[PDB]
Design a protein around this ligand. Structure first.
Ligand SMILES: [Zn+2]
Lengths: 105, 52
């Protein structure tokens, strides 16, 4: 239901089968709320805020860090027990201590 | 409140005084107090570990 312009406007209603990870309560009184401020999405409770805690989620950018995370999410680079990095290139798991292959990957 | 004796009952609790000449709303107050608690507890614990 949330899109680019309603994300700070509509409360968020959840199914309280499990306790809230923030307030340790079985079922909350009111739906939670989202807010945007200086590049961080803040989620809190509505009604009596002191009933629950507040959570901050940061989003800043860093194209290069995002690229690194996306590359890491494909499980193409792995670290072994001995400490060498193995990469998945051209249908093979390759490692080479003297010639690094992360840049090739 | 004060201390009647500084030679035997020097034992006290950890306490702080904060006064900010401004008004904050509920959400900013809550995030600020969370961060304050974390920072101050870490600083005091590090001092205790490294000196006491
Ligand atoms: Zn909660």
């Amino acid at each position: 239901d949330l899109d680019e312009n309603n994300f700070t406007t509509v409360p968020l209603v959840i199914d309280y089968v499990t306790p809230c990870a923030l307030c340790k309560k079985r079922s909350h009184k009111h739906p939670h709320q989202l807010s945007l401020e200086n590049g961080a999405i803040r989620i809190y409770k509505t009604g009596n805020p002191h009933s629950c805690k507040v959570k901050i989620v940061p989003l800043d950018g860093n194209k290069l860090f995002n690229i690194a995370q996306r590359i890491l999410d494909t499980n193409s680079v792995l670290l072994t027990e001995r400490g060498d990095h193995i990469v998945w290139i051209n249908n093979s798991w390759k490692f080479n201590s003297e010639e690094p292959l992360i840049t090739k990957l | 409140e004060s201390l009647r004796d500084e030679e035997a009952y020097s034992i006290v609790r950890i306490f702080m005084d904060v006064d900010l000449d401004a008004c904050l709303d509920e959400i900013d107050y809550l995030t600020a107090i969370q961060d304050f608690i974390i920072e101050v507890s870490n600083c005091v614990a590090r001092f205790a570990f490294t000196e006491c």
